[PDB]
Design a protein around this ligand. Structure first.
Ligand SMILES: [Cl-]
Ligand code: NI
Length: 118
């Protein structure tokens, strides 16, 4: 029961929050200065909105896969590693007054993915 995380850097956080609330029929789960996120049940999605500074267009910030528990992150980190991808693991972190275990991989064209648990 994992779900994709889509993180967008948006030029207008307030406008984006309103648009996404309408699109998914649900308000944001978390709102902070320059930051919001939506936990969408259907489609299963963690949508993250980060306000850009003086930006003109929405762009991809990063992608991810949100899993249930640390064991799944661990399983993923091992699996990705064995597949031959370069991974960077984080454990028991800090950011967003929250705690996360995660593993980062980067695609060929530079798009970064985190497999993580909140
Ligand atoms: Cl995955
Ligand atoms: Ni993220």
């Amino acid at each position: 029961m994992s779900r994709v995380q889509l993180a967008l850097r948006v030029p207008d956080l307030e406008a984006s929050i309103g648009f996404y609330s309408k699109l998914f029929g649900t308000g944001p789960a978390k709102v902070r200065p320059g930051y919001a996120n939506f936990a969408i049940a259907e489609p299963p999605l963690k949508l993250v909105l980060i306000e850009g500074a003086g930006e003109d267009a929405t762009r991809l910030d990063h992608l991810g896969v949100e899993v249930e528990d640390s064991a799944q992150v661990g399983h993923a980190a091992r699996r990705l590693k064995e597949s031959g991808l370069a991974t960077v693991e984080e454990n028991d972190t800090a950011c967003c007054y929250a705690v996360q275990d995660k593993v980062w991989v980067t695609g060929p064209g530079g798009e970064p993915w985190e497999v993580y648990v909140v």
